[PDB]
Amino acid sequence: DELYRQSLEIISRYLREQATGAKDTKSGATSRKALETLRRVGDGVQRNHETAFQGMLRKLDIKNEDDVKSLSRVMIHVFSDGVTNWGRIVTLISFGAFVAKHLKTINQESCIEPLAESITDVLVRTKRDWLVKQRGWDGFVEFFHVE
């Protein structure tokens, strides 16, 4: 499953960076470019909705690094009106990164892997053919392209 493998790579890499604060050195043409986009736009949505995300995290009441089931239902609920766009998708990933950060403060040795798998699952399973229709992450990259 290339699309799943690729989406998880991007999403884990971003969440790990945000949580620990360090980049990783390690097929990545659109991937490196998608992560570049995510870093720029992700930080964008986090910066201006800081109070809202904090509000959402308290409400979410995350216990540990494996307690992702409530975040999963939230993501299903976002999409349940039948509207799909990269704005929503980037906001969810950006929120996961916010959650990852606070998980590293209440431990500092948590795999962010469950969080990333959880986000990638909802995305790729429930929006599979949608993502394929626009060449996966090139769609994401092009939508957030600034000149």
């Binding site: 736009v41 964008g44 949505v45 909705h49 809202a52 509000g55 959402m56 409400k59 979410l60 009441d61 409530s70 239902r73 939230v74 609920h77 976002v78 349940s80 009106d81 509207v83 766009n85 990269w86 704005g87 929503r88 998708i89 980037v90 906001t91 969810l92 929120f95 939508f143 957030f144």
Partner: peptide, 23 residues
């Protein structure tokens, strides 16, 4: 109720982001 509120703020922010970049 809690999950509904979180979903709705993520949706609002996401749609706002969408609208911006779809200029």
């Amino acid at each position: 109720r809690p999950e509904i509120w979180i979903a709705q703020e993520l949706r609002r922010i996401g749609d706002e982001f969408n609208a911006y970049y779809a200029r």
